[PDB]
Amino acid sequence: SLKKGPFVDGHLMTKIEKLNETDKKQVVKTWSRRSTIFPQFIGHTIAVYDGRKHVPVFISEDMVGHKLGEFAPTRTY
Amino acid sequence: KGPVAKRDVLPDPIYNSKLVSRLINKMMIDGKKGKSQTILYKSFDIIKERTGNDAMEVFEQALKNIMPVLEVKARRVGGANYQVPVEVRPERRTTLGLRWLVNYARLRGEKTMEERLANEILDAANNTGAAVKKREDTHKMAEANKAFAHY
Amino acid sequence: IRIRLKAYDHRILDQSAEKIVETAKRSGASVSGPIPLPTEKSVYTILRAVHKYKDSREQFEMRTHKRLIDIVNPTPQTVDALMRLDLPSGVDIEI
Amino acid sequence: GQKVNPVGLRIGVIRDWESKWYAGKDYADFLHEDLKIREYISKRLSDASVSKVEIERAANRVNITIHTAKPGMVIGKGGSEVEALRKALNSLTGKRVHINILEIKRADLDAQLVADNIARQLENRVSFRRAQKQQIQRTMRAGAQGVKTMVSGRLGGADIARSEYYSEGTVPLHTLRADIDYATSEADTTYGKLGVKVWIYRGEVL
Amino acid sequence: AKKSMIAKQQRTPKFKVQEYTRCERCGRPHSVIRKFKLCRICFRELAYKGQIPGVKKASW
Amino acid sequence: QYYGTGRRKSSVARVRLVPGEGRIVVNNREISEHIPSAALIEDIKQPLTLTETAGTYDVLVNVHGGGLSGQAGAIRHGIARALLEADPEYRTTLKRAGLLTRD
RNA sequence: CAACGCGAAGAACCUUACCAGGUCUUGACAUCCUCUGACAAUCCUAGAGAUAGGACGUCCCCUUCGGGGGCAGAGUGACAGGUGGUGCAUGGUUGUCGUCAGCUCGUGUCGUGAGAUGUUGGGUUAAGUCCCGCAACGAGCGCAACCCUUGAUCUUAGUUGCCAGCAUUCAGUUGGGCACUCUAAGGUGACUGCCGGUGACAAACCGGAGGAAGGUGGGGAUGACGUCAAAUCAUCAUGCCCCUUAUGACCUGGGCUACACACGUGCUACAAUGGACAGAACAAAGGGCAGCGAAACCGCGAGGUUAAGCCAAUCCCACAAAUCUGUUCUCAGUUCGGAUCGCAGUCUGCAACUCGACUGCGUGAAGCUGGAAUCGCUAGUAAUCGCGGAUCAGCAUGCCGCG
C-alpha cells in the first residue's frame, strides 16, 4: 500500500474501536498478522497467533511502523 | 583420417601482411576483432613514431628471432618419460611465435596493451626479450634431448 | 471488399482458394489472385518421459496458412455467388 | 524408452486429421467437449465394437462420423438407436449434434477392434497363444501385408511378467508411408492388469 | 487424494487470486498447459491419436 | 537494370547495378555516413579491383539485417553476384573467390 | 555413467502433499433408496474460517392431473476416500548400451548333441550398404531411401510486402508498378549425373567440368533383438495388503525458503581488450482480447494518469546491446565488483513481515585469477552481447528458441 491508505482488517478495526470508545481493556485476540499497526493500536496488548499459540504483545508508540508478524516469530530452533 | 585445410584474410591497409592478419585474428577476446585491430594499428603507429623505421621490417625481424627451430616433444617409452626433439614446420613456427609474442606481451604489464605490444616487438627485434627467453629455453631443451634426434 | 482464409490444411486451403478465384473470375470481376500472406506458426516442447529424464523432449508443430483475396469490381453477381458457395469447415471463411 | 506409435507420426504424410475444424477462443473448450463425447460414446458402444469416431465443427453444428464395422448393432432398428445416441449427446453438450455411421469392411484388419477382441478373449480366460494365433490368422486371411501383436503383464505368473511377440509379414515401422493402423487395449484380469498392443501394416501409398 | 483435489479446484475460491489451474482431465498440477488445458502426457497421447487438429510432429 | 542479392548471414544486399559513376548507397546513406572503420571499405572493392569496373556502375542497396561487418560482407557478395550476372566474361577469374559461404 | 537448474515450464493464502490449532463424519467427490419443495441472491453475530445462530427470500418447468427433467435439504444403510505400502506382481510412458550395427525367421544340409551352415572367406561403405566366391536358396526387424527445414532456379500472386523506373511526401506516408527482396503454392534440381585413373571388367575409392549443391550437401523426426528385477503404484488404471467418526474431508496460520556444514549446475567479480559520460548504426524470431497497448503528460528512477491502434505482413509489444567515433581516469583493494547492509519508493495482489523483482539515496567487504583433479568445444563450432514465449494477478542467473 502506497497511496490507497494504510492496511487493517475490518473485524480487528471494529474490535479496537469498540475497545477504545470507552477504555482499553483485556487482550484483543486475532489471527491477522497481515494488519499494520496504527496509532490506535497503542495501549492495546494485542495477541498474535504464531501458528500454535497466541503471544500477547503490548503495542507502544513506536510500533506503528511495523506489522504484527514482525513481533510474531514462526520458525523454531 | 588426415589433415584439414583452412584460410585467412590478408588485406590490411596498415602494414599489409598475412602474418599481421593472423596476429589480428590472435589476441582477440570475446569476438571483438575490432579491438584487436585498433590495438595492433596503434601499436604499429607507436613503433613507427618512436623508431624511424617501417614497423613491417621490425615485425619480420621479431618473428625471425622468436620463431623456434626445434621443438621438444614428450614421449613415455617405459617408466622414463623421455622427450624427442622435433623439426617445426614453418606454419607451426609462425603460430608458436605469435602465441609467445601475444602471451609475453600481455604478461609484461604496462598501462596499455598497445605500449606492451610495442615494447615486446622492440625487445623481440633486439634478441633480448621475454619471448626470446622462451625460445632459448626451448632450444636448450632440444639440445639436451639431442640423444633422440631420431627414434 | 475483401475476404480472408485461415486453415491448417495445405491442400484444402489451396483448393478453396482456387475455387473462390474461379467463381469470382468467371463473372468478370478482375479479382486479384490469392495473396500468399505469411503463415503463422508455433512450437511446443514437451518431455517424452513421465517423471525423470528431463533431457528426453519432443516438439509439436502448429501451422495456419492465411491468404487474402481483394475484389476489384463490385459485381454483385460474384457477391451472391460467394455467398452461396459452400466449402469445408477447415478454412473458417471470414469476410 | 522404446518405439513411438505411428498414429502421431503419419499425420500430414498420408493420414488426415481425426478432427477437422478451425476454432478460436474456444479451442480447449471444444477439445474437452469432444473428449467427453468420445469417452461417453466409447463407454456406451463398448459392446457395439466401435473402432473410432471423428468429429467436425460446423458453426454450432457437430457432424460425428462413426466406424463400427457392424451397422445392425449401432443403428439396429434405426429409430431407437439414433434417438438414444443423438439426444443424449445433445443434452450433455448443449447444441445440435449430427451423427453419421460408416461400416468398416474386413473388420479383422483395424487395430482397435483387433485389440478389443483379443482383450475380450483374454478376459474370457482364453490362452494367450490360441487367441493370438487365431487373431493373426484371421487378419492375414482378411488381407494385410503385416500384423504385429504384443501382450505384456501377468500371463499366468505372479513373480514375473514378460512380453510375447507374434507377427507375420512385413511391419516396417521406420517406413514413413505405411498407413499402419495402431491401437491399444487393456484387460483387467484376476491376477492383475494386461496390456494389448497391436499395430497392423495395411499397405503403402506411392 | 485426487478427486478431492479436483473438487477443491472446482470450488469457488474466496478471491479470484486464489484460483489455480488444472488440466481438467487428471489431477496433475506442476506444468499444466494453457492453450490446450490438457495434461502433459494426456495432451501428448491425444495429439498422437489424431486429435488436436493444429498440432503435429515438428522438425527444423 | 542488373539486379543481385548478396545473401550472407541473414544480411541481404538488394543490389541493382545500374550504369552510373561509382556511387555506393547503403540504406539511403553515404559510405562514410553509414560505415566507420574503413578497413572494410577497401575490402568491398576487392572484386571491383580484380576486374576494372571503377566508375561505370552505381550501387543502390537496401541492406536489411546484420551488423556492420555482416552488412559489408553481404554488400560485396551481392556486388560480385550482380557483376557476374551482368558480365560473366570474368567468371573464370572470380570463381577463385566465390564469396558464397551459406553462413 | 543412466540422481543432484531432475519430477516441479515460476511455494505470500490458493498450488500445499507436511505440521500446530478450530472442526465434520453416505462425508470434499459419483451411482444408489423414501420424500418436501427450486436453488440462489442481500444482510446482522461468532468468527480464522470451516461452519452455524439466523432475517430479508426462492420466481423451477413439462404434459389430456398420475408423473417426469435437476438442485437443496431430511433419515437408512450399499458406498466414497486413500499424495497409504508393494515399479522384486503389472498395463501404459521413458533413460542406458545406441544412431552402435547387428538381431532373427521358412525350406534344405551337416553333426546321434547342445548347435553350425544362411550371418563364415576376399574387396568395400557411416552401415550384415553393396559386389565376388559360396553348401545353400529366400525373407523380416534394422541401416540409406522416400518425411520436415535450409542452401539455387522456372512459373502461379502482388496487400496489410517492396519503392526502381514516375510525380508528390517530415516520414513508403499518397496516385501509381509488380520491375525486385519478400512472403505461400505447383515444379525442377544433386541423383556417382558425366570423364580419367584405381580396383576384378564388378561393388567400391581419388581426381575433373557444370552447378547452390559430389559422393547419406548440413540439421531435425525416425532409437533394430534385448540388458540394467533401471525410473514412475505420484499423471492415469492396477491385483494384493491396511485405515475408515479416519492412513478420509473443510478452514486460519505455519513449513515446503532454518545452516557451524560438504558437494553438483549456473550467474557476477577480481580491471586497462579496463571504469564512467557525449554522439551514431544494424537485428532475427515470437505474442496480443477483461489481452497487447502507440502517443501525450507526471516523476532522476523503477513506474502512474488520459488514450490512439490491434482479433493482427496493417497497430503495438519494441528506440536491441555488444560495436564504432569522442571526453575522462590511471595500476589502487582503486572512479574495479556490486553481495551483505539503513532509509525512501515502483509493478502486482485482500496482504511481498517467514515471503519476489525492480529503482534512488550512503557505504561497501569476499575478492587481485584461485589444490590435487576435472569439464565443454573441429566452423559459423568455441567464446561472447542482446531479443521473445512458456509456468504467470506478481515472480527466471534455469528451460525453450532467435539473431
DSSP string, B115-138: HHHHHHHHHHHSS-SHHHHHHHHH
Q: What span, in angstroms and rounded, lies between the C-alpha atoms of F103 and F94? A: 19
> Nearest to residue A30, comparing CAs of A60, A54, A62?
A54
User: What's the DSSP call for residue E36?
Assistant: S
Which stretches of chain C sit within 8 Å of chain D by CB?
6-9, 48-49, 56, 64, 88-92
Contacts of F82 by beta carbon, 8 Å cutoff, 6+ apart: F2, F3, F4, F15, F16, F17
> Nearest to residue C27, comparing CAs of C67, C70, C69, C73?
C73
Within A1-77, residue ranges assigned H as helices are 10-20
Q: What span, in angstroms and rounded, lies between the C-alpha atoms of B83 and B148? A: 8
Q: What span, in angstroms and rounded, lies between the C-alpha atoms of A28 and A18? A: 11
What is chain B's length? 151
D interface mutation test: which of E33, E45, E46, E55 has the most D CBs within 10 A? E46
The C-alpha cell of B38 is what?
585498433
Determination method here? cryo-EM
Partner residues linked to F11 by β-bridges? F8
Partner residues linked to C46 by β-bridges? C58
> B44's torsion region: left (phi>0), alpha (psi -120 to 50) or beta?
alpha
Q: Residue A58: helix, strand or coil by DSSP?
A: strand
Q: Count the Cβ atoms, other than its own, within 10 Å of residue E49.
A: 17
CA B90 to chain centre: 12
Q: What span, in angstroms and rounded, lies between the C-alpha atoms of B5 and A51? A: 73
Within chain D, residue ranges assigned H as helices are 27-45, 79-93, 111-123, 130-142
> Nearest to residue D66, comparing CAs of D30, D111, D99, D112?
D99
Contacts of F81 by beta carbon, 8 Å cutoff, 6+ apart: F4, F5, F6, F15
User: What's the DSSP call for residue B42?
Assistant: H
Which phi and psi (to 5°) does residue B2 adopt?
A: 160, 175
CB-based contact C72:C30 (threshold 8 Å):
yes
Question: Within a 13 Å sphere around the CA of F47, how many CA atoms are in the beta-carbon half?
Answer: 21
Q: Nearest-5° angle of CA B27, CA B31, CA B33?
A: 55
Which phi and psi (to 5°) does residue B75 adopt?
A: -160, 125
Give me the residue label for grid cell 487395430: D111
Torsion angle of C-alpha atoms B112, B113, B117, B118, degrees rounded to 10? -30
Which phi and psi (to 5°) does residue D161 adopt?
A: -125, 125
Helix (H) or strand (E) holding F58: strand F57-61
Q: Residue B31: helix, strand or coil by DSSP?
A: coil
CB-based contact D149:D196 (threshold 8 Å):
yes
The C-alpha cell of F40 is what?
572494410
Q: What span, in angstroms and rounded, lies between the C-alpha atoms of F64 and F74? A: 10
Separation in Å, CA F96 to CA B23, F9, F74, F90: 25, 21, 18, 11
Query: Which residues precede chain breaks (C–N over 2.5 Å) in chain A?
Result: none
Q: Which nucleotides of G are covered by protein (CB under 7 A)?
A: 3-10, 12-17, 19-21, 28-29, 45-49, 80-84, 88-96, 139-153, 156-160, 162-164, 179-186, 210, 212, 217, 219-226, 229-232, 234-239, 248-255, 258, 272-274, 281-284, 286-287, 289, 311-313, 320-325, 330-331, 344-347, 349-354, 380, 382-385, 390-393, 399-403
- Look at the alpha carbons of B18, B21, B25, B27 in this order and tell me if their dihedral is positive or negative: positive
Q: What span, in angstroms and rounded, lies between the C-alpha atoms of A21 and A40? A: 11
Helix (H) or strand (E) holding E55: strand E55-57
Give me the residue label for grid cell 497467533: A49
User: What's the DSSP call for residue D124?
Assistant: T
> Nearest to residue B142, comparing CAs of B85, B69, B65, B81?
B85
Q: Count the Cβ atoms, other than its own, within 10 Å of residue C72.
A: 11
CB-based contact F82:F3 (threshold 8 Å):
yes
Which nucleotide's C1' atom has the smallest distance to the CA of D159?
G89
Q: What span, in angstroms and rounded, lies between the C-alpha atoms of C65 and C46? A: 24
CB-based contact D34:E53 (threshold 8 Å):
no
Q: What span, in angstroms and rounded, lies between the C-alpha atoms of B23 and B117? A: 11
Give me the residue label for grid cell 491401437: D183
Helix (H) or strand (E) holding C68: strand C57-70
Which chains, if any, share at least 3 CB pairs under 8 A with chain D?
C, E
Q: Residue A3: helix, strand or coil by DSSP?
A: coil
Contacts of A45 by beta carbon, 8 Å cutoff, 6+ apart: A27, A56, A57, A58, A59
Q: Count the Cβ atoms, other than its own, within 10 Å of residue E35.
A: 14
Helix (H) or strand (E) holding E8: helix E3-10
Straight-line distance from CA D41 to C1' G64, in Å?
37
- Look at the alpha carbons of F86, F91, F93, F96 in this order and tell me if their dihedral is positive or negative: positive
Sort B121 into a burial class: Cβ within 10 Å, 0-12 / 13-18 / 19+. Answer: buried
Q: What span, in angstroms and rounded, lies between the C-alpha atoms of B71 and B87? A: 6
The C-alpha cell of B106 is what?
600481455
CB-based contact F60:F12 (threshold 8 Å):
no
Question: Within a 13 Å sphere around the CA of B3, how many CA atoms are in the beta-carbon half?
Answer: 2
Torsion angle of C-alpha atoms F37, F39, F41, F47, degrees rounded to 10? -160
CB-based contact B68:B136 (threshold 8 Å):
no
CB-based contact C20:C85 (threshold 8 Å):
yes
For the residues of C41-54, what is the DSSP string, one character each? EEEEEEESSSSS-T
Q: What span, in angstroms and rounded, lies between the C-alpha atoms of F64 and F27? A: 8
Separation in Å, CA C28 to CA C22, C24, C25, C75, C85: 10, 7, 5, 8, 17
